[PDB]
Design a protein around this ligand. Structure first.
Ligand SMILES: CCCN(c1nc(-c2nc(N)cc(N)n2)cs1)c1cc(-c2ccc(CCN3CCN(C)CC3)nc2)ccc1C
Ligand SMILES: CCCN(c1nc(-c2nc(N)cc(N)n2)cs1)c1cc(-c2ccc(CCN3CCN(C)CC3)nc2)ccc1C
Ligand SMILES: O=c1ccn([C@@H]2O[C@H](COP(=O)(O)OP(=O)(O)O)[C@@H](O)[C@H]2O)c(=O)[nH]1
Ligand SMILES: O=c1ccn([C@@H]2O[C@H](COP(=O)(O)OP(=O)(O)O)[C@@H](O)[C@H]2O)c(=O)[nH]1
Ligand code: NA
Ligand code: NA
Lengths: 229, 229
C-alpha cells in the first residue's frame, strides 16, 4: 500500500540505532533506514568518502563542515529513496523508520555548525538553498518519534559505546544539541521552511532508563502512535 | 510540443553569451538559459552567494573549488528546469539554448580544478557522486554547438570584455580548457559517465573571426543542424 514514513530523532547516543534494530525485527511490515553518518563511523565509495570527511572534520571543522553536511544529507536522501522504492512492496501496513531525517541534518547539525562558526554565512546560505531545493517535493514524514535523553545519559552512552573519536565530546556540545531537539520537537518554537512539519505528529519517549531488555512499553507507544496516523 | 535542448559550449570569452543573445531574438520559438556563473560576474540570494564564492575563489581556489562547483551546477540545474517548465509552451518548433551544461561544469571546470589540485580526491569523488546522482534522469541534450576559438582569440576577447578579475588569466589556463573542449567535443576521446552523450550530435563552429555584425552563416548552420534533430 502507501509506506508510512517515521523519523527517529534524538541526541547523539540517546539510543536511536538500538531502538531502530529492535523495531525492524518485530514486524515483516517494518523496515529501517540507518543513518549514513552512523554507517561511516570492502568499503563502498560512499563509506571511503564518508570516513575521510568524518576524520577531516575532527581535524578542522571550519574547513569541512559544508562538505560534510552536503554529503551527509545527499547520502541520507539516496538511502531513504532506495528503501522507499526497494522494500515493503508486499506489506499490508508498511512502515519505514528513518534513523534521523533531512530536518535533523539542517536544523540540528548544520545549524549548530553555523552557530559554532564552522560554516561562514555564504556556506550556511548556500547549504540552506541547496537543502530547500534538493527537497523539491516523496520523503515527507507521517510522524516523528523523539527519543528524549538527558545530555548526561548521552555522555554515559557515548562512554558505553566506546568509539575512540567520541570519548572527548564535552557535555556542553550535547547540551547544545539537546536544546535544539527540545526547541524543534517538544516546545515546537523552532520555525522550519517546511510548512507541513508544523502539522506532523510527534511521539516523545523518555529513554533515560536502559531499554535494551525492557522495551515493550516503548513499542506499545509506537504501535498506538502508528494506529493514529 | 517537446522542447529541443541544445548546449552552447566553448572556452572562456569564445563568444557564447554574444551568440546566445543573437539567437534568442531570431525566433519566438527560440529561448536561452544564461549561465548562472556568467550572471554572478537588487541582488537575488543566489547572486549574493555567487559573487561571494567567485571572489573567494580568486583569493583561495583550493579552499572554495568544491563549494563553487556544487553551487554553480545546482544553480544551472534549477535555471535550466525553470526555463523548461516556464517557456515555449505555445511554440510550434520550441528550442531552448543552454549557455554551457552540467557536462561542462564537471568535465571542463571541476575536472580542471581537481587536476590543478584545487580539489583533493575526496572533494572530487564527492563532487562526481553528487553530480551523477543530482542528474537522476529531463535536461538530456538533443545536440551541442561547440563555438571553437583559439586560446589567443579568447585571451584577446577577455581583454575586449574588460572584466578586471579576468585580465590576469594566463594563456596556459585557456590552453588547458581548450584541450579539454577539443578532447570532449571534437576528437570525442573524453569518456563521460553519461552513455547517451556518445550519441549526441555536435555542431562545431569556428568563431575566430568577429561575428557580432556578420553571423548569418553561423545561424544558417544552426538552422540546418536543428532540422536534422
Ligand atoms: C558525534 C558528533 C560528530 N560531529 C558531527 N556530526 C554531525 C552530523 N551531521 C549530520 N548531518 C548527521 C550526523 N549524524 N552528524 C555534524 S558535526 C562532529 C562534531 C565536531 C565538532 C567540533 C567542535 C565543535 C564546536 C566548536 N565551537 C567553537 C566555540 N564555540 C563558539 C562553540 C563551539 N562542534 C562540533 C567535529 C567533528 C565531528 C564529526
Ligand atoms: C573566468 C574563469 C573563472 N574561474 C573558474 N570558473 C569556473 C567555472 N566553473 C563552472 N562550473 C562554470 C563556469 N562558468 N566557470 C571554475 S574556476 C576561476 C579560476 C581560478 C583559477 C586559479 C588558478 C588555477 C590554476 C592553478 N594551478 C596550480 C599549478 N598547476 C598545477 C596548475 C595550475 N586555476 C583556476 C580562480 C578563480 C576563478 C573564478
Ligand atoms: O537503552 C539503551 C540504549 C543504548 N544503550 C547503549 O548506548 C550506546 C548508544 O546507543 P545507540 O548507538 O543506539 O545511540 P544513537 O547514537 O544511535 O542514538 C550504545 O553503546 C548502546 O548499546 C544502552 O546501553 N541502553
Ligand atoms: O565575435 C565576437 C564575439 C565576442 N566578442 C566580444 O568578446 C568578448 C567575450 O564574448 P562573450 O562574453 O560572449 O564570451 P563567453 O565568455 O560568453 O563565451 C566580449 O567582449 C564580446 O563582446 C567580439 O568582439 N566578437
Ligand atoms: Na522488519
Ligand atoms: Na526568442
Amino acid at each position: 500500500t502507501r509506506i508510512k514514513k517515521i523519523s527517529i530523532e534524538g541526541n547523539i547516543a540517546a539510543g536511536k540505532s538500538t531502538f531502530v534494530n529492535i523495531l525492524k525485527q518485530l514486524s515483516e511490515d517494518w523496515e529501517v533506514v540507518p543513518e549514513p553518518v552512523a554507517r561511516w563511523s570492502e568499503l563502498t565509495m560512499e563509506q571511503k568518502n564518508g570516513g575521510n570527511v568524518l576524520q577531516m572534520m575532527y581535524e578542522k571543522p571550519e574547513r569541512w563542515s559544508f562538505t560534510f553536511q552536503t554529503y551527509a544529507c545527499l547520502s541520507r536522501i539516496r538511502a531513504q529513496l532506495a528503501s522507499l522504492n526497494g522494500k515493503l512492496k508486499d506489506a499490508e501496513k508498511p512502515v519505514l523508520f528513518f534513523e534521523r531525517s533531512v530536518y535533523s541534518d539542517r536544523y540540528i547539525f548544520a545549524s549548530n555548525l553555523y552557530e559554532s562558526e564552522s560554516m561562514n554565512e555564504t556556506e550556511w546560505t548556500i547549504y540552506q538553498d541547496w537543502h530547500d531545493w534538493m527537497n523539491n517535493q516523496s520523503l515527507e514524514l507521517d510522524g516523528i518519534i523523539y527519543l528524549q535523553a538527558t545530555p548526561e545519559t548521552c555522555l554515559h552512552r557515548i562512554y558505553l559505546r566506546g568509539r575512540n573519536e567520541e570519548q572527548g565530546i564535552p557535555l556542553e556540545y550535547l547540551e547544545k544539541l539537546h536544546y535544539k531537539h527540545e526547541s524543534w520537537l517538544l516546545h515546537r518554537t523552532l520555525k522550519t521552511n517546511f510548512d507541513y512539519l508544523q502539522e506532523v505528529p510527534i511521539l516523545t519517549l523518555d529513554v533515560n532508563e536502559d531499554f535494551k531488555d525492557k522495551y515493550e512499553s516503548l513499542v506499545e507507544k509506537v504501535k498506538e502512535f502508528l494506529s493514529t496516523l
